[PDB]
Design a protein around this ligand. Structure first.
Ligand code: Y3T
Length: 173
């Protein structure tokens, strides 16, 4: 049976319990922690592509005041994000199951869109969404999934100082 598990789920939870933040800049910043998944249960001989996009967890604008994240009261419809393709796509199931599938190269921006960069709306909450699509045979969506531990708020600068401490501790950047 299909099984797609989040690697380093405990560190992701460490960030989630404080409300995770990801820096968005004009040219882009890589995510931390890195989105990595362990995959099993695919057809080892079928052809698949791994895609990544970002879905807004809600339509509100968030702000960090008095040490707490709070939403606004004037939500807006959100535009669909650009779709990032894993550089190993397309590939066989045996390749995707051999080792963790890492999305370390994607860069989150507030402007530049495409070629590895994905533009997000600042101060909005997002979930990364992984898509496994079968490319051969009858092409079909195998799965589309968001891991709740990977939820984050896009920021132009870190607001929670505990988040800054965590990023410095576990990411050399
Ligand atoms: C975004 C660049 C971009 O998104 N390029 C791109 C997207 C797709 C795509 O939407 N694939 C897809 C979506 C949903 C789904 F269910 C399936 Cl099966 C496939 C395909 C190909 C692409 O580029 C080649 C920035 N741009 C400026 C909007």
């Amino acid at each position: 049976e299909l099984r797609v598990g989040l690697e380093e789920s405990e560190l992701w939870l460490r960030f989630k319990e404080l409300t995770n933040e990801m820096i968005v800049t004009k040219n882009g910043r890589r995510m931390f922690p890195v989105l990595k998944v362990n995959v099993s249960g695919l057809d080892p001989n079928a052809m698949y592509s791994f895609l990544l996009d970002f879905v807004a967890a809600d339509n509100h604008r968030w702000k960090y005041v008095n040490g707490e994240w709070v939403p606004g009261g004037k939500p807006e419809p959100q535009a669909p994000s650009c779709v990032y393709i894993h550089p190993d796509s397309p590939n066989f199931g045996a390749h995707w199951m051999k080792a963790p599938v890492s999305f370390s190269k994607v860069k989150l921006t507030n402007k530049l869109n495409g070629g590895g960069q994905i533009m997000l709306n600042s101060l909005h909450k997002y979930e990364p969404r992984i898509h496994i699509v079968r490319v051969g045979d009858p092409q079909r969506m195998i799965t589309s999934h968001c891991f709740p531990e990977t939820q984050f708020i896009a920021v132009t600068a870190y607001q929670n100082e505990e988040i800054t401490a965590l990023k410095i501790k576990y990411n050399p950047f």
